[PDB]
């Protein structure tokens with residue numbers, strides 16, 4: 001469960017991301033395909049080369065859904081209902097992959113926001129991304 | 142979430158376990174310790190030899206806790222509240238281990254319930270033990 | 283796969299009793315029922331909407347035998363799992379696009395099926411040996427992924 | 429482990445720039461803050477009730493440096509991580525009773541810290557080579573568990 005302090009931490013951290021969210025989503029994805037090549041099995045239809053437009057475009061979508069989550073932190077299941085449906089019934093991504101993308105988002109944030117990525121903030125973001133993952137795999141079976 | 146049919150399947154299977162629960166809990170633990178030796182690091186104070194009285198005694202407690210969760214299947218977070226605090230604040234067992242014990246419980250039930258361990262029931266039990274593990278892990282941070 | 287000789291003899295001992303045809307079908311079927319997201323790879327198999335639909339699907343049953351035939355062939359080469367499964371690895375990666383975690387889930391379901399079929403004979407020590415084997419087979423199948 | 433020469437040299441080049449004192453202290457402390465259950469192994473270090481307390485803790489800092497020192501010495505032996513960490517694996521299992529899953533957590537935390545410290549220079553390719561090293565080390569530390 002996210003505490004009041006976690007919520008504050010995540011809001012602050014995400015706030016500084018601001019207009020770079022798109023670029024960071026893309027970066028996290030690239031970091032994921034390279035570090036954990038098994039995740040590429042879910043995107044055989046994408047050109048996955050460095051800087052490709054599918055990845056760029058997909059990064060924005062991911063980052064935007066996260067912005068939405070932060071804004072609806074107190075009501076995530078409802079705000080993410082449609083994406084939960086998507087991941088569970090159509091895409092059917094194995095749950096173990098959520099942890100991998102989450103770590104890569106954390107590394108991306110650590111690389112771009114040195115001042116803001118304090119230890120307490122690091123802890124809150126990890127909890128937040130986990131909470132997001134639980135919701136997204138909530139309707140799998 | 143567990144569905145009405147899941148709940149029915151779980152009460153039926155566990156019902157058939159009946160007075161064998163303690164024994165199956167002990168065997169589940171033996172299976173885990175031998176198949177996944179890293180789990181032994183949480184029990185350095187136990188005698189872990191086969192037939193160990195300590196293993197037997199602890200098997201019974203695991204099994205009684207599961208019997209209670211089954212008895213309160215519509216209120217598990219509250220029924221297992223105390224156990225969840227113990228695991229989170231005193232014992233601090235890494236979450237990955239719950240999956241291992243759960244798998245060993247299923248293997249134990251399969252070995253002893255040939256007629257009741259149908260595909261539908263196997264599925265319900267797996268979902269049930271995963272909901273139990275989630276509760277026990279919910280207050281870790 | 284670091285397997286003791288007694289581990290290895292226990293595996294082969296039991297395996298000689300397995301009806302591979304029937305066990306392959308039960309294991310693949312149960313995979314699709316317990317972990318329904320794995321159904322994403324078999325839409326051409328037809329009806330998979332309920333347990334009986336999955337478990338009795340003749341296409342599931344026939345595919346199950348194909349999987350277990352390959353697994354058996356693996357138990358005959360325990361010291362060279364990676365070479366034995368290399369072409370199957372490439373194929374599952376480059377053509378079929380299957381996440382290797384699926385190989386781990388199948389292994390665990392196979393372990394449940396063996397226990398289901400053999401009862402007490404599937405002793406803790408025998409389980410522990412089979413757990414090493416299914417992990418080794420899963421690692422071998424994942425090894426050519428890139 | 430299966431490390432490419434360009435991968436081997438990327439790792440080495442970056443490690444030449446790491447301040448072990450700072451990074452060690454930061455990695456161990458963050459592990460304790462982000463995954464509070466890992467504090468079970470360090471009761472005797474003192475106050476760990478808050479991040480500031482953990483990060484301020486001199487035993488934590490001193491111990492963090494020792495860990496990265498050991499890590500430092502593993503990178504000079506990348507073709508034999510197992511032999512290099514054998515006694516340490518034995519100690520972590522037999523004397524300390526540490527679940528190896530914790531080794532994976534420390535690894536991922538380490539990667540986050542290298543990222544935090546080096547920013548731009550910690551590119552996706554550099555990350556990938558470091559994820560391989562970190563898994564290698566975790567695996568070597570777990571190898572003598574029984």
Ligand code: HEM
Nearest residue numbers: 039042043061062065066083091093097098101132133136
């Ligand atoms: C942090 C958790 C994640 C979030 C917030 C997220 C978000 C999204 C969003 C917003 C979409 C676009 C849906 C649309 O077009 O309206 C999407 C699609 C997709 N996601 Fe996720 N995702 C997450 C994790 C994952 C991971 C772990 C995988 C598997 C590695 C994955 C695989 C996919 C795939 C394959 C698509 C379809 C892409 C396409 O064909 O365009 N997602 N996701």
Ligand code: HEM
Nearest residue numbers: 180183184202203206207224232234238239242273274277
């Ligand atoms: C199915 C999920 C589990 C349940 C229902 C469960 C239940 C219990 C119960 C009832 C107790 C006894 C506490 C008391 O005496 O009041 C206990 C203690 C304990 N559990 Fe669990 N447990 C589960 C999983 C695990 C796992 C996965 C581990 C670690 C691998 C673990 C490690 C322990 C330890 C080390 C103790 C204390 C034993 C002692 O010192 O006497 N448990 N658990």
Ligand code: HEM
Nearest residue numbers: 320323324348349352353370374378380384385388419423
């Ligand atoms: C023990 C591990 C496994 C082994 C030994 C195995 C073996 C095989 C074999 C021999 C084939 C036929 C190859 C061909 O058509 O040329 C095959 C096909 C296939 N496998 Fe696997 N397999 C395993 C696990 C899995 C799992 C877990 C999945 C996905 C959940 C999977 C997905 C597929 C698919 C989608 C096909 C092609 C189906 C078709 O003909 O349409 N495999 N496998």
Ligand code: HEM
Nearest residue numbers: 466469470491494495498499516524526530531534565569
């Ligand atoms: C990068 C992986 C790790 C390496 C290379 C490593 C290495 C070391 C070394 C060199 C020591 C000093 C032993 C001595 O004094 O002779 C040590 C001690 C210890 N390690 Fe680790 N370690 C790692 C991860 C972990 C983790 C994740 C934990 C638990 C969270 C842990 C728990 C301990 C404990 C409890 C000690 C004893 C410290 C004391 O003297 O109080 N280690 N480790």
